[PDB]
Design a protein around this ligand. Structure first.
Ligand SMILES: *[C@@H]1O[C@H](CO)[C@@H](O)[C@H](O)[C@H]1NC(C)=O
Ligand SMILES: *[C@@H]1O[C@H](CO)[C@@H](O)[C@H](O)[C@H]1NC(C)=O
Lengths: 79, 50, 216, 88, 50, 38, 76
């Protein structure tokens, strides 16, 4: 006789799994434990505007945005 | 905008105003390190189980 | 470049059981051919075996008077060779009359172009290999706002002929190669812009503004 | 900018999945917080489960996908041979 | 013997589906979870008026 | 624009599916809240 | 009236082997004018597409709610 039972369980969020929990309890246990599975973002240099920072002048924040975006470009090109 | 990030922008603007491109690039790289490349604008809270 | 379509020819060498679903004609022509103005290019020709048990009943009559219906089961290993080709723009094809590439996905991989093992809206899943699906999009605006301009395919034995007849498995221009599927050790890759595909789980949500911040 | 008052007043857990942070597309982890989150008004979610900060809003795109693929392959092979010989 | 069971569930709103639920409880559990199944909008340039 | 007072008063949850948000016709996702909900 | 209030103006039909004859006898599988082609059905690999105005169908789940005004707010 030969018996081989392999179970691989991968969880993201919710109550941690173990063989002693039913699927109902796992599904109802996600009331507090939450994990972001998907997300979207925007480049950081696009929010830099005098409209976002009225305190600073125009050309100063413009140069700030220019150096930030060229830093990002150098960062992406290095790798 | 968050206080630390605004302060970092203030420091970068002040360094640029002094006509110094040496420390400006280093500070920009440090800011990139501290605050990533993209600011998350939306997320999807959830769960998964395989 | 311009991608005119793909088609997978299926040739049966024993029986007619494996080519019933593993064949796929060209989308634009409805056959294993290419649209006018395109050159069919051998993408990859490979083979596939599969064992199946067929039950058949035969009415045998000995001496024309002793007739009996006997049912027998035979386990036959069907062999079929499948050839996938692709249609590239031979010259100045009319624009924008053509097809676009929306990404690929398999049963074991994930397609970042849609973050899911499927295709976006306005995309048809077309079968090229035993497990490779290609998202094919017809609308001009839908492809322009969702799909990505394409450079060409190449395989373990054939390269992209658009390099600048010797054949090199190199992406021309600023385009980059990325894996699509593995078919019995033969690497399959496609050339697309490196900017759109950065290998990051972040969704490339690029919309407005369409310009860097204008100076005062 | 402390939400402990919200917890004491509403006795409800605040949402732990909050956007607005800086994310590197290269190594794919969080580096820090770029947005400032405030709890002056203790803005609660619609269905009464969390108290999001005043700088975010939640859209109830509730979706559930369950897939169950169970494949069972059973094979049995039994062979019996009884040979009896008698010589008298 | 060969058995193959394939289940696909696609939900929009309501209690998160699990194998051990009947449709009665699912329908009675919609009293607090809802998602916009349909929507209709107007152009935003149409609002900004005197 | 805090509806919590209504929750403490009537002890009855609030509607989550609410209009007035901006919807992009291209990617089809909410982008922000335009109308004010008092 | 029901068609005018619900239907969309039509451009023509074309398939994997036959094109719209309204282009301007050679036949080309290209929607004329400002009409765009959209897929309808796939029959054994033969593509079927129809030509309609691009303004109506924009590829969004949002309902094309267009009624009044039939002119922009007139200037002073
Ligand atoms: C273990 O072996 C027995 C045979 O004695 C078999 O019936 C059973 O299916 C095997 N697996 C488990 C999980 O018991
Ligand atoms: C599983 O196999 C058995 C045969 O033992 C069959 O009766 C049954 O319908 C199959 N499916 C399920 C879900 O049990």
């Amino acid at each position: 006789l030969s018996n081989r039972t392999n179970s691989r369980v991968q969880s993201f969020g919710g109550v941690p799994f173990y063989p002693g929990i039913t699927l109902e309890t796992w599904q109802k246990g996600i009331t507090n434990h939450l994990v972001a599975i998907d997300r979207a973002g925007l480049p950081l240099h696009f929010f830099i505007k005098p409209d976002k920072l009225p305190g600073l002048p125009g050309p100063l924040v413009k140069k700030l945005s220019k150096t930030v975006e060229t830093a990002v470009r150098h960062y992406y090109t290095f790798n | 905008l968050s206080l630390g990030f605004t302060k970092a922008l203030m420091d970068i603007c002040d360094q640029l105003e002094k006509n110094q491109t040496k420390m400006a690039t280093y500070l920009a790289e440090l800011l990139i390190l501290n605050y990533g490349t993209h600011v998350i604008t939306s997320v999807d809270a959830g769960a998964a189980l395989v | 470049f311009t991608f005119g379509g793909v088609y997978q020819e299926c040739t049966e060498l024993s029986g007619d059981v494996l080519c019933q679903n593993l064949e796929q004609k060209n989308l634009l022509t409805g056959d294993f051919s290419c649209p006018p103005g395109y050159s069919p290019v051998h993408l990859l020709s490979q083979t596939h075996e599969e064992g199946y048990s067929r039950l058949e009943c035969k009415k045998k009559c000995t001496l024309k008077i002793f007739c009996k219906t006997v049912c027998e089961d035979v386990f036959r290993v069907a062999k079929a060779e499948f050839r996938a080709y692709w249609c590239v723009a031979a010259g100045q094809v009319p624009d924008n009359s053509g097809l676009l590439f929306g990404g690929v996905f398999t049963d074991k991989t994930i397609n970042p172009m849609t973050n899911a093992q499927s295709c976006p809206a306005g995309y048809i899943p077309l079968n090229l290999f035993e497990s490779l699906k290609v998202c094919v999009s017809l609308d001009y605006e839908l492809g322009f706002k969702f799909s990505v301009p394409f450079g060409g395919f190449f395989s373990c034995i054939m390269g992209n002929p658009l390099v600048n007849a010797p054949s090199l498995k190199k992406c021309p221009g600023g385009f980059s190669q990325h894996l699509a599927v593995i078919s019995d050790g033969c690497q399959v890759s496609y050339c697309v812009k490196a900017g759109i595909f950065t290998g990051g789980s972040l969704l490339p949500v690029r919309l407005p503004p369409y310009t860097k911040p204008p100076l005062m | 900018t402390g939400f402990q008052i919200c917890k004491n007043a509403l006795k409800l857990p605040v949402l732990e999945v909050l956007p607005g942070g800086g994310w590197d597309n290269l190594r794919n982890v969080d580096m820090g917080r770029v947005m400032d989150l405030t709890y002056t008004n203790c803005k609660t979610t619609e269905d009464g489960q969390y108290i999001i900060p005043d700088e975010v809003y939640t859209i109830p795109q509730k979706e559930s996908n369950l897939e169950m693929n169970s494949e069972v392959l059973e094979s049995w092979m039994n062979y019996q041979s009884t040979t009896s010989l008698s010589i008298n």
